[PDB]
Structures are given as structure tokens and as C-alpha cells.
Amino acid sequence: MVEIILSHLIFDQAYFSKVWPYMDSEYFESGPAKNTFKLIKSHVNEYHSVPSINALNVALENSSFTETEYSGVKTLISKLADSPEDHSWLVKETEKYVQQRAMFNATSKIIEIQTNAEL
Amino acid sequence: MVEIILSHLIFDQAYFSKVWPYMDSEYFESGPAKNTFKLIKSHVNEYHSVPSINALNVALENSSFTETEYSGVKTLISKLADSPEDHSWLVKETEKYVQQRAMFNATSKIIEIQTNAELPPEKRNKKMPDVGAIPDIMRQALSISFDSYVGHDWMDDYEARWLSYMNKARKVPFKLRILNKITKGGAETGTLNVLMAGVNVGKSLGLCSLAADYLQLGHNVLYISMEMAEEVCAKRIDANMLDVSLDDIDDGHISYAEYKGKMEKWREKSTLGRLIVKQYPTGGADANTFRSLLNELKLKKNFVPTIIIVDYLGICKSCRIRVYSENSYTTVKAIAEELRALAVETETVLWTAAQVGKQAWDSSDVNMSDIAESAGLPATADFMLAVIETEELAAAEQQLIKQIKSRYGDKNKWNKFLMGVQKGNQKWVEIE
Amino acid sequence: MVEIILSHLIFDQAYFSKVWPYMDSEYFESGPAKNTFKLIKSHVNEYHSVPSINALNVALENSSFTETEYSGVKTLISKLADSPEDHSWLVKETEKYVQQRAMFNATSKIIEIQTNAELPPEKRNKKMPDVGAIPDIMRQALSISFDSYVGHDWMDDYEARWLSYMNKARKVPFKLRILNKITKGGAETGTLNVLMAGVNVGKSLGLCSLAADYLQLGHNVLYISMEMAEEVCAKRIDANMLDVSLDDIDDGHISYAEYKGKMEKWREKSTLGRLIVKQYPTGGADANTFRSLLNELKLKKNFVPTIIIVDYLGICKSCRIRVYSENSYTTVKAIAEELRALAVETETVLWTAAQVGKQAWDSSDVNMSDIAESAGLPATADFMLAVIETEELAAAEQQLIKQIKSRYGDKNKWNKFLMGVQKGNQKWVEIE
Amino acid sequence: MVEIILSHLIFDQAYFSKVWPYMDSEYFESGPAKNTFKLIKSHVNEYHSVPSINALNVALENSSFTETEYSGVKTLISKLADSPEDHSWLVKETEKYVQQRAMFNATSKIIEIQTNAELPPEKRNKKMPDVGAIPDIMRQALSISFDSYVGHDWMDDYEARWLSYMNKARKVPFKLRILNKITKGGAETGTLNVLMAGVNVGKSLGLCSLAADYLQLGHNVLYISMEMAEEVCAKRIDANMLDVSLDDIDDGHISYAEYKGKMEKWREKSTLGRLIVKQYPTGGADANTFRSLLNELKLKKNFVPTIIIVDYLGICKSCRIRVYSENSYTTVKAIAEELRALAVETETVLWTAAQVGKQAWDSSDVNMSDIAESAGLPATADFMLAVIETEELAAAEQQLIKQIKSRYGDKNKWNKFLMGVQKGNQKWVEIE
Amino acid sequence: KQAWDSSDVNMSDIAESAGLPATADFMLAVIETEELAAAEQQLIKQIKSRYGDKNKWNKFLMGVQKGNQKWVEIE
Amino acid sequence: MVEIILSHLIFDQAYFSKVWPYMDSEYFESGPAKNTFKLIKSHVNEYHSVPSINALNVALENSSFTETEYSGVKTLISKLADSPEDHSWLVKETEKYVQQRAMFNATSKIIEIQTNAEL
Amino acid sequence: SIPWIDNEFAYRALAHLPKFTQVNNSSTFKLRFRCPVCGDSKTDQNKARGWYYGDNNEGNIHCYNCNYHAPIGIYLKEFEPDLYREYIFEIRKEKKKIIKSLPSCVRLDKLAEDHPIIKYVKARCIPKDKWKYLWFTTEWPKLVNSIAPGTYKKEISEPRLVIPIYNANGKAESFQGRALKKDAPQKYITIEAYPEATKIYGVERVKDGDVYVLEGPIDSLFIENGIAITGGQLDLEVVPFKDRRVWVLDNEPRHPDTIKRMTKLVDAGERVMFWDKSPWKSKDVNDMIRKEGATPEQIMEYMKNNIAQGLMAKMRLSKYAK
DNA sequence: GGCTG
DNA sequence: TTTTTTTTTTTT
Ligand SMILES: Nc1ncnc2c1ncn2[C@@H]1O[C@H](COP(=O)(O)OP(=O)(O)OP(O)(O)=S)[C@@H](O)[C@H]1O
Ligand SMILES: Nc1ncnc2c1ncn2[C@@H]1O[C@H](COP(=O)(O)OP(=O)(O)OP(O)(O)=S)[C@@H](O)[C@H]1O
Ligand SMILES: [Mg+2]
Ligand SMILES: [Mg+2]
Ligand SMILES: [Zn+2]
């Protein structure tokens, strides 16, 4: 549900206030999702406000990643759209998603440590 | 982002009032963008107002273009909407766009100058400048920042300056008459104030005393502990407010009846504020953590702190520099700069402690050079007081406070004054 | 004409004696030409003589070259011949070729710089100069010539020495006669003057005193404050010129009527300039921003300064080095060079105030081994003073100036003199 | 390279007389080169003279070679070069060629020895050296050098050394009889000589007097100044050379006509040298910048100095210490070592000056113990002259020169002597 | 090294870091002189006392017995 | 090195005394090794002594498994020999083997727990 | 970076280089050419070890002879500064066929049992029914030139085993020839009817349940639902059954490329097969069958109890590394 | 006929 | 190239 998380980070001030302090770059993907979130995080760090679609497109054009990554980010941004939702279902689902991604990263790092120490 | 620039030129007066002063046809393009900007400029010159879409289209019909350019201009004009983006981001982005286009034009101009220079004198054009004009051409293209404010004038703005003299809203009183006397009205918002001393001299005692004094004045105080626990510091605040002792709290000399009676009596007071104590592990926090903590505090409770006390800047962790990337003179100064930036952003009085090197741990006096961490901290600081305690002073329970860096007032008018520090109550007492 | 240059380097001696010290490997294309010049340069460095054709064919065989490079070098060596021409057209043609190659290299370097700047952080190359360094590079390339001056040659440069004896540079006088005595009439136009001092000892006090003194002499003064608000600096100036203490202004002892009367009395005087105070955030202003400010001051206010004053050199942006790239010494030296270049370009006396090291704090004497950020500042500066109000001068309401580097006269004549610093009025009075 | 070696064996005399004893048949080849060298060696053995081309061809005709050998030798003989290459490069290159061939032959021989060693003992060659001879064989390969000069060999260089004592090859006279008397003919090349100045003794007056005296004797002088500009030092030089007082130049008593006439009169004299004055900032010139300056002067100005005079040792910077102090002993000791190393490596007489100890200042007599630089300057200085200026000597326009350290001769021979100092013309005259 | 064989040990005499006193809840300085050694006693000085006021009872004499590796009081 | 471990469990004595308490059926495998260790553990629980090869064959005969694995188990007990290896190396290698298998089992268990939590 | 302009500039600069080749697939821009830095191999004049990759984030050149690898810009500036300056300025300036005939092909099922290739496939132990999908040829170059003229300069009589590759429709759009001899230019010479022909074998034979992706089609023969990506670049998107497919690579734990591919697969969260408990230790399935005597049903049993994905796959891969 | 970082 | 701790040494 990365698309929903990003869309409500863009088109919801109440959602951004609670989820943002906790959102991190290692919770989305290794492709378009992480790049879009890095764009959003850079814009937030530079201006302390949630970027719009135009701002995201401008930052995308002023970016150095390759054609595949550019196309993926462009498609993901074009797919972002606000939907009629309720604050609770989104906060709980985001908490579940963040916890699952944290567990996945933790177990991947555990496997990496085990396979590195056995060298 | 030419489309955004044109759309917010037509459909936003605030954007037009800060960017139109610095805008040229060379900045945009050589195709439809330049023609659209030329139409806008012609319309604003003939009639001193921002044109509308219908007026722009009528002017485009009146103006003459070839078929390709006509189609491009029509297509571009069709693509204009209000789109209320942020003003700060918009002005920063248009400044960046103008700077990059100006640099590109300057590079092309100097390349053309160099190419023309190699031509024989008969063939070369006399309009292009000589090679000696290459540097300044590249310099005028590096001075195209968006800034219309020139600054004060001291003769054309003395009325406004006098009115600013009457704006004392930045001052925050101290609840201590000597500190107000030496600060000419107390500390100011958005300033880095430091209370430095040796190890086990009363730095956190002074911080808690300031927190209690600000609490009794109705301020919101955010105490950020870096070594002690939340309940330990709150015990010191209780000893200051309830005014019984530190040992009597731990020795059972206070019953739950007296404890409750005093807390409820302080609750009944309408001159009391709010105090939140937050603890962090050593080397794990800075303004980046502090800003998130501020946002969470504001969201969860109606708490916007006017006073922010940091237990120690040294124990804090810099934002950009890693835990041990560089030496003390850098990361300590970086943390000091970040804390001052946070204070000036939140418009809050920031208090922190500083350590003193071993050379002044047993000396009757301490100087500014006796700062254990970077000497950049006594550069970002504003009111760096100093606490000096000796055997004679400890006999009289009177710590000596020396004015080390006084930006608010005269550092040498009352350089050294005695306080009445009560260690059991964690309180500073003025001496008269 | 690389082939001709190589041929006359090998087969001619006067040409070699005239052009060799100025030739460089970067002036030749990466093909056979650069490799042949590398062989020639290595032979000259190893044997201090011009190689022959046999020497180079021996050097080519004893070289680590690919087949293409070997074939190209051998063909170029075979093509070399001694074409008889005149040793007045060869030298000028070689100079033209070297200048063109230098310009080409500079253009490529700036085009690369611009490409590097637009890259996002954590991917862009480090230690590569920023965009603001572009003009300086273009200033170096235009300075290439086959004429070099290394030192002053007695009996060869004596007309210039006689001119220096008889002629004296124009001087912008101070208002304090002691500074005129130690500077032989004041400070010159294109100079960088620094008033180093410790923390909270009068860096801005001296600069504001100088600004007031110059304003009373009819100069246009621009005060760029990087640490203080515009109203604070203007209040220092008001205290200097209205003879009212800062305590009186803050406490409200003076009324608006008296303030307005004094301001209008100062206005009615014809011997008054214009002082404009501009505030920039710490690390947010550089030399290019100052040039933009000067351009907008000239265009929108008809204001051309002479006594540009920068509050603190160590806070300003590098304008040549990216932020947090080099060490403090290199960055501060670059800032000093940029500021002196700005002063020379604008023909304005530039005054600044650096900070001394922690050792110099509360030290009765200071020297050049006390500057905190960079010891290269005296080399770039044209006049440097110090402030030694350590322990007892404050009680006596006095100061002390070391005269660390004085290019206007001799530093060891009036090296240490006492200044009557008055902090309430923020001015310097003379002890005479 | 073999073609060049054979050609310059046939068509040269100095090259033959230099390289023939170190020339062997095994150094060339196994084909045409070896046969040609065998013919040359046979001819030189039968007739003790270098063969000619016709004689070489006659010998080849009357020789036992096959068709391929005949063709190869004939082609090589027809390919000889009479080009007059430079001697130094030719000798060095043929030495390198011989060394490489000897190393290759020795390596092949030891490989063959090892291969023969790993063979049935019943079946091996007896003539092949044993394995234990391998380390010696390689030694014979490494003991191949056309010219052996490792240091000074007593009893093997006594004839050359005597030519040094009679020709005074190392001494540089002083133009002052007293200074020549106590130095046994002047200062020596590759030495560091310093002057110790007490109370009322300028350090640059004596250095300028020495520079002028060396200039009048025909020496190239490089004066590196620290605390003064090039024009000021050259003005002191003019005062001493043109007999004009120093204050007369500033006042304007001497006109351009007299100045130019005296300068041209000096230029007419053929016994005059060149003086190059180079200025460096205080603490911005270590004894590695001087090496770069010398390289630039040699390359561009063709100026190779014999006298180098540094204005002040204390103002200089130690390259080894990097950190700089206004008056620190470790830096002075390092600066002296670096300057003496520069003098030794450049074969120049190096002059500098220092201040004597405060006790030395009060006492007319100055002891090596009474020196600001203790165990640092009287350890790296070949000559240390001490200058004493008391009230009685100043009233008589004299200075007492005392000899505190004389590596040249006995220190106690003529220790005290009175010098006729003129402070206006910056000159030292002798006293009868 | 400067604090060895000295009748008094200050907080500034800490060997390897000045941060250790800053990051330590309680510190006690053990001082032994020839007179104290002859009396089988050691002087414990409260250097950093975070649980109470260090000025009170700053220096008291413990009865260290080195043979039994034991601290005994004198009260 | 499961063959070495089983062979020195059956034959060697001091190694058996030192290593038997730190032995579990989950450390070996899910195939013939696990079945052989289960047989050995059952025999040592019944009779408080180390079994012999003939005893192992008797236990296979009376206590049977499915022939698919039973053939693999009977061909697994055909290689256990005395092979008098040094005690220190044997103990160290057995400790390393059991530690590696314990790490593998713990990682698999935490992965299964995470998978179950998602359900 | 700007890939297209760098590719264009590299094309312009290297158009004249020896052995210059425009090796550009449907998704990559590679240029093969003889390395001008070193002349490629001195022995082999037909080697073109200079390769430019534009598919990379920044078009980079690398020689496999002199091991010289750099960005295109570095080479351009150090070899052709003239066009290098123009390029560096431009930087901110921009700122189907179906096979229907089988000549010289006799299907193995209908082939004579006494044919030597039949004996060899018996040594390969292939199931008899599978022979209805394999043909044998004595004129493989002749057959290819008959179907695709100009492929072989001479239509030499070469016996190979031809596996036609049938699409999901079951249409042979390609064919792989295995040389019967131990010596050959290539073990598996695969020629497609059209460039867009399917690279996956056995797609028409996919049944319900999990689909096993293997390396060799012959290996897939022993396996139900055994598909074989016939060489090429491993691309998940071109692979169907993205939900239910099972990855089975070779049993070569120490081999680095195999583990690299397996890491790539698992990082995509795929479902892969593990040999860390396989009773047999041969490299592939067929080797276990012919040598260890591995029988297909045992293989399927092991594989259905050894498929792992996600963190389970990752941890089971760590041990299988070495 | 591919294979690099 | 500076900055800061601690130590050890030495020179005045
Ligand atoms: N409001 C004031 N009233 C009286 N004296 C003042 C006041 N503000 C500052 N001073 C005095 O002015 C002295 C010099 O202050 P500054 O001019 O700020 O020196 P400074 O070097 O700029 O300080 P920095 O920038 O923080 S290093 C201080 O030491 C005070 O004694
Ligand atoms: N529980 C207590 N009871 C009585 N006095 C105490 C107690 N804790 C501390 N003190 C006194 O407080 C003085 C200094 O207090 P501190 O706040 O610990 O000083 P500080 O070490 O600079 O602050 P820190 O290190 O951030 S806790 C000590 O010298 C004691 O006399
Ligand atoms: Mg403390
Ligand atoms: Mg200031
Ligand atoms: Zn190569």
C-alpha cells in the first residue's frame, strides 16, 4: 500500500502530521517508491512543507537517475491521487506496513550478519 | 518549469510582485516560451497590469507569428492554471531557473567571443566584445539573485527604527532581579544562552532553577535531559517549587497529605505554566530530533514551549556530522549553530550547560578560554554566564556567577555577583 | 601550429630560450603532440639541454606507449624539420597559440564545473570548485603571456622604483588622527582591512565606530551585518552619532522629540553621507550576493559605496568552495581573496573583523600566530589590527591595538597604542 | 641505441676515451652489432687507433663471415651517424644501455646455473659455476658504472684537493679587509652565516651592506625580504650604492637626473652583478618556497645566484614544523637547518640575522649562552657575527663586531673589532 | 602521574579523560600517605557526589586492612 | 561432518561423555542423520549405554520406518568407523557444527514466526 | 546523467574504431570495437574487447584486454578534446515467423532405435516419450540455410539434436541444436524464426500447479511443468506464472555467478529451490540421474519440500553459499 | 559470444 | 591546515 501512503502524505495534512515523524526511506522499496519518497523527503527538508504534484515533477526533472527509474517515478507520481478515506484505517494500516517492513529489514540484516561472520 | 512560471505570472499577483523585476526574454527559451513571455511583457508595457488568458489570446491574434510558432504559443497558452503552490518554493525554484539559464547564456556568449576572436580582423564582427570582457560577463551572470530589499538607511528609516526600539516583545524576564538588571530586561527569544561551570558544581541545578522560575511566571518550559531520568529532574523541580528539600523527599519527612496540598495549591494558581521533561540517551539527539519532539508535543497537547532547556550541548549529537566524524571544535560548534537555528526558528529562549576543562575545575575564577568543548560555542552563544564555587563560597552557600559573554548588555558593569544557591532545594536565591 | 613549435624547440636555441619556461603539457592535444612534448620535457628535466632527433627516438623506444601512440609519436618526430623563419613572428604566434589553448582549457573547465554543480548531493564530485569560482579561472587564462616578472631586478627595474619613490597612492582619511599617523594618510581604495579581536571584546564596536567616522566625512557606507539585526547595527550607529548611550535608548530615557530633533540636525548638515545596513543570515551571503546588492543599490537607490563594511569574515559564504568541503583555513583564505577582489573591482575601502584563537583571549599580547580560522588572512589582507582589552583595560575604559600587518606604513613604529573605547556610545576616543 | 654507440665510437674522441674501457663484446648482441664491435675491437687492438669507415669495410672484406653476416655488417656500417650529440647525454645513455645488458646477461647466467644444478650429477657441465657463485656474479653485474665518484676518497683525491686549497675554490671574499682577515679569505659556499643584533642594531642594515658589497664584486645576489617590500630593500641598496642618504630620497633632494646618471655609471662598469629582490609575507616563506623561487629564476630569469640573503630568520617558517610561532626555539632550530641544507644543495653563501638575548642586549659582551636562539643557532651556523651598538659607539658612528662562532677560523684570533656603521647610507666602512 | 605520592587528590587529577567525571554518578578518591599507611588507614575524599552534598563529610578515614582486603569504619 | 559425529558417538567414549548432553535431534538433519540420531537416543534412553552397530541394525529391524528413508538410513549406518581422531579438534568441530545448525534453526523459526504474524 | 546524448557522442567518436559494432538489443545500447587504447589482443586481430555500455546509468567504456574502464567523458577528454568540449557544452545545452518445415530432421521418437544418437540419448537417459519433441539432423547448417538462408556460408553436414521452441500456441518459432560431438563451436546453437520469438521452452506444456524454471530443456524433460528459459538475459517480466513459478538453478554452490543469480531472484522475493539438503551432489539433475542414479520422482519429492521464498529463502541461501 | 566497475 | 584533549619532555 505504498501508493496510498504517498498519496495521503501529499493530499492529507492530518495524515502527514502523525505518520511523517516515523516514516523512513528503508520502508518502501528499492525502486520507484524509494525514489519518490526521497524526492518528498528532500522537498520537506528544504521547505518544511508537503510538495505538490507540480513540485514533485519539477524535482523529478532535476534528478540524475536513469531512464528506467525516471519512468517508474513518473508513473508512480501520475498514479498518486487523493481518495475518500478515514484517518483511523490509514494510521493503523500504515503502522502495520511500517512494522512489517522493519521486521523484514531486520531479518535481512540478521541473515547478512550471519553469512558475513561465517567468512 | 517555464509553464509554472508563466501560469503564476498571469494568475498570481504576489509572484508577479517579486519576480517581474528580474525577468528577460533570454531567460526562457527560443520557441513558444519566449514568444509567450514577449506577449506578456508587451501587454504589461502597453497596459500596466497583468494580462488575462482572453487578453493574451487576443494579443496573440493581433501579433504576427509563423504557423509553427503560432501553434506552439496557442498550445502553451492553453496550458495555464492557478495551481496555488507554496510561495517560498516557487520563488526559490524560479531563482534557480533564472540563475541556470543566465549561466548557460553567459557560457554561450563567451564561447562565441572566443570563436570570433580567432577569426581574421577583416572577417570578425566588431559588435562582439574582446576576450578581456569574458570574466565580468561571467560575473554579472552570478549576481542575479532575487532580492529587492536594500536594507536600512539610518536617515530615511529612523522613525521605523524608533518604533522598533519600542518593540520589547522579544524580552523574557528572569524572575531574578539581578539577572534582569544585567540583561537589560531579561533574555531574548531565539538566542543561545549557556550556563557553564565545572563538574558537580550545579549546572543542572541552575537549569532546573531557571525552569522553575519560568514556570512560576506562566511560561511553557521544555526540559530535555541527557543524563538524568525524567523522575530525577522532576524531583529537583519539586524541591524548588514545593520548597522542602531533596533529602526530605527521599527520607519520608513529607507525607502524602502535605505533598498533595502543595501540588493542588500550585494548580490553583493562574500564574503557573506547563513543564514537560524529556530524557534522551547520551549522544542521540539534536534539533532534528527536537523539531519532531516539538511537533509531537504540539499535536498531542496544547503545548508550545516558550523556554527550551537542554541538559548539556556536549551530550547532544550533531545533525550532519556523524558521531565521531570530526574533532570537538567542529561538531560542538555545529551543534551550537543547530541549536541557535532551532531557537530562532521557534522564537524560544534556549538554555544549555557547558563543561569547563580541568585547568579551571579548582580555580577561584574561570575565563571564556576555559571551555572544555569547542571555542565556537562561545561564538554562537549570547549570554554565557559562569558558575564558580570555592571552599569559602561553599561555606556561605554562595556560588559566584561571572558574566563571561554578555551580548544583551554591558559585560563588565556587574562582572561578578554572588548568588544564594541552596543545594538541598535546587534553588538560586538573590542576595540583597 | 604544434608541429612548428616542436620543430623550433628542437632545432632552434633563441626560440627555446624565449618560449620554453612558459610552455606546458596542457597546451597540446592528447594525440602525438602531448606525448612528444612529454618526451622533450622529460629529456630537458633529466639533462638540462634540448634533445636531438636521435635522443627522442631513443626516448620513444624506451617508453611505455601503445602501438597507436608509438606510431603517432614516431610519425610526428619524422615530420619535424627546421623551416627558416623569423624570430619575431614565431614568438608572437606561439604566444597567441598558448593563449588560445589556455582559453579553451578554461572554457572546458567551467563547462565541467557547471555540469558538476547541477548534480544532486552525495553524487557530485568533491574538491571541484563551485560556480562562483568560474570568473576567477577565466581571469587566470587571460593572464598567460611569455613575459614573467619574478622579483624586483635592481639596475633593470629602476624607473618604476623611482616612480614609486616620487608618487604616492591616494588615501581615504580616517577621522581618528592616530590611524592617519600609523597609515600615512588613511587607507587606499582597493584594500581589505581586518580588525581582529577576541569574542565579545569590540569587533563590531570598532567597525561601527569606523562606519560613523566615515559617514561624518561624507562617504557612502554599506554595513553588511552577518550576525546582528539591521536595527541593532543602526542603533550602535545612532549611539555613536547622537551621543546617547545604548542604555538610554533601551530604557527610553530619550524621547521621540529629542531623537527626531537630533536626526534632523544631522540631516541638515551637508557633510554627511548615506549609511545603508543590510543583514544576511549566517553563511547565507557571499561576494556574488554582495555584488547583486551593490547592483540593486545603484539601480534602485542611486547608491555607490566607498567604505563597504563586513561585520564578520568567518561567517560569510566561500563563493568559491562548496559549503563544508575544505578546512577552515582554505575556506577563510578564499573568502578573504574574494572580498579583496570585490574591493578592487568596486574601488571601495573594505573593512572586516576576524576572530582570534582561544589562546589570544585574555592575553596581554597577540601576534600572527593567534588567528583562529586561517593564518593566510594576513597575506591576503592589506592592513590588520588587533584588540587587547583583556583584564585591566576594561576597568580603565581603554583598549590596545597591536598592528599585526600594516602595508600602508611600518608596523614597528607605533605598534602598540592605547584606544579609549567607550562602550555606551560604541565609539573610540583618543587618549591625547 | 647500438647504432649511436658504434657511430660515436667511430666518429668521436672524448666519447671513445671515456667509454672504451667499459665496453665488451657481450654487451651488444648476437648478430650484426656484435660482429661490427668485434671488427672495431680487432682493429683497435692491431692498430691502437679508432678505425675509419673505409678501413672498417676493408676489414669486413678480409674477414670470415657468412652471407647473412656479411649483409648485416655491411648494412650496419653503411648506417653509421656522424651527428654531434651532446656528450653528457651520450655517456649517460650508453652507461644505462651497458648496465641493462650486463644485468640481463647475469640473470641469464644464473638461470642457466640453476638449470644445470638440477641435472644428474654424472651428467652436467664442469665449466658452469656452482650455485654458490650466484650472489657474486650478480655483484659483478651491479659493479658496472662508467664513472665512480662516491664521496671524497682520501689518498685518491689528494691532487684535486690541493688544487682546492691553492685556488681557494670555496671562499667568497667580503670586500671588507677585517672580515676577510677573520674568515681566512671570506665565507664559504654551502654555508649559513648569521648576524646577531643587540640593542640599537638593525638586522637589515648589515644584510644590505653585504648585498651591496657582493654586488660590487660581481656576484648574483638574491635578497628575500619578509618584513619589507621589494622597493624598500632596493632603496636601501640604492642608498649604499649611489651614496645618497636614505632620507634624501624620501625628501626629494636628489633629482631624477643625478639618480639616472649614477645608475647608468654603475651599469657601465663590468664588475657589477645582478640583485633580485623577492618579497614574501611574514611566516609565509619556508625553505621550500625558496627552492621554487630559485627554480623559477633559473628557468625564466636565467638568474642562478651565488649569494642568498634572507631578511630575518625568525620571521621565516619551518617547513618541517608546519605550525608557526612568533618567537619559538624549535622553529628557529628547524629554520636554520633547512636554510643550511638549501645553501649546501645550491652551493651558495646564505646570510641571515637574528636578535641576541635580552641579557646580551644589556651587556656589551654577548655570550653564545646569551643568545635568544640557544643551541639552535650556534649549532647550524658556520659563522655567527655579533654586532654591538652602545651609546659611546653610536655617538662615534661605530658598532662593535664580536665573533661568537667561526667554523672558518679560530674564534679568538680577532674576536672584537670596531665597524664604521653609517645608518643613513646603510653602509659599513672600515676603521683604521 | 602528578597525583601519585600526594597528600591530596583532586578531580582534575583523573588520568585518561575529563569526561569520565562528567559521565559518572558517584566518584570516591582513595588517598594513602606514609602516616596513613603506618596507621592502617586511608582517606576517602568525595570527588563527585551525585547522591548528596559532597561538601559535607568530604574526607573521612577508612580503616583499610590490606592483609584481609577489607574496609572497616572508625566510628 | 555428521558421519564423524555419529561414528564417534557410537565408538568413542570421552567424546560421548563431553558432547552427549549438548545434543538434540534438531541439530542434525531431516533425513537419514536425524533418524540415526533418534535411534541412538532411544537406545541410550532405554539402556543407559552407547549402542553397537549390531544393536543399531536390530533397532532398525524392530523399529521400522518407511522404506524410502529406511534404505537411506541403513546405507547411512555402513560407514561409522573408529577413526581415532584427536579429542580437541573433534570437540571444537562438533561445537561449531551444532552452533551453525542452532543459528540456522533460530533464523528459520523467526522467519516462520514473522510469516505467521502476517497471516 | 544524460544517457542518450552520451550514447550519441560515443557513437560519433567510435564510429571509426576497429571492429566497431552496434551491439544494441531491445533495451541496451552497447558498442563493440577494438580497443584503441591497447589494440585489443595482439594475437587476435578480430577481438573487439572495447565495449561501451549506454544501458548503464552513465555510458561507460571498458576494455577486456587492457582492463581499462572509464566513463565516456573521461575517454573523450583524454583522446578527443575537440569534440569533448562540444559535448561538455551540449551537456548544459540540453540542461513474426513460425517454422513450418523440418528439412533433414527425423524426430527421435520415430527415429530408429539403432541410431547412434538414440544410444547417446539413452546414455543421457531421456524419457522415451520426450523423443517426440526432439529431432535429429545430419545437415544442421543446411537445414538452417534452407529455413534461414545466409546463416551458414557452407551447408556442411553437421548432425545435431534440434529442439523446436513452441510458443504458448505451440508454434515452433525457434530451434536449439545440440552438437552430438564433444567438440563444437557451441553446445547449444539456438536460432529463432524471428527476433521476438519466445525464449522459454515448454510453455505449451505448462500444466496446473507450480511451474519449475530450469536451465536446460533436457533437464525440463525429466520434470513435470518444467520450463526452460532458453538462454538470453534473465528477465522476470518476460516470464509468465509470476505468481506460481519456481526457480531451479544448477547445484553449484561455490560457483559465484549462480549464487549471484540466486541472490537477484530472492531479492525480487521469488520462490527458489535449494540443494542444501539434496542427497545427490552432482551439478545438475541429469548428472544426478545418470551418475548418482537420481530418479525423477525423488527429485520432485525433494523439490516440493525445498522451495523457499522471502526471508526463508534468504537464510537458506546464506548457508548454501559455500 | 558473451563476459567489467 | 586548525582543534582539542593527555602525556612527556625540554627549555627558560
Ligand atoms: N546593549 C549593550 N549595552 C552596552 N554595552 C553593550 C551592549 N551590547 C554589547 N555591549 C558591549 O559591547 C562589547 C562588544 O560587543 P560586540 O560589538 O558584539 O563585540 P563582538 O566581537 O562583535 O562580539 P561577537 O560578535 O559575539 S564575537 C561587549 O563585550 C559588551 O561589553
Ligand atoms: N540528592 C542530592 N541531595 C543534595 N544535594 C545534591 C543532590 N544531588 C546533587 N546535589 C548537589 O548538587 C551539586 C551539583 O549538582 P549537579 O546538577 O549534579 O551539577 P552538574 O553535575 O553540573 O549537573 P549534571 O552533571 O548535569 S547532573 C553537587 O555538588 C551536590 O552538592
Ligand atoms: Mg556534572
Ligand atoms: Mg559582532
Ligand atoms: Zn584495451
Residue numbers in the entry:
A (entry chain D), F (entry chain C): 1 to 119
B (entry chain E), C (entry chain F), D (entry chain A): 1 to 432
E (entry chain D): 358 to 432
G (entry chain H): 3 to 97, 115 to 341
Reproduce the article's own wording on this structure:
The T4 bacteriophage gp41 helicase and gp61 primase assemble into a primosome to couple DNA unwinding with RNA primer synthesis for DNA replication. The domain architecture of the gp41 helicase resembles the bacterial DnaB helicase13,14 with an NTD and a RecA-like CTD that are connected by a linking helix (LH). Here we report a series of cryo-EM structures of T4 primosome assembly intermediates.
The three primosome structures are similar, but not identical, to each other because of the asymmetry of the seam present in the gp41 helicase; they differ in the location of the two gp41 helicase dimers that bind the gp61 primase. These poses are similar, but not identical, and are referred to as binding poses 1 through 3. In each binding pose, the ssDNA 5′-end emerging from the gp41 helicase consistently passes between the gp61 ZBD and RPD domains. The three gp61 primase binding poses are observed in the T4 primosome in the presence of ssDNA and ATPγS. In our initial primosome structure, there was no density for the RNA primer, but the density for the ssDNA was present stretching from the gp61 ZBD to the N-terminal lobe (NTL) of the gp61 RPD; therefore, this structure may represent an ssDNA-scanning configuration of the primosome in search of a priming recognition sequence. The first state is observed in the WT primosome in which the primase interacts with the ssDNA template in three largely equivalent poses.
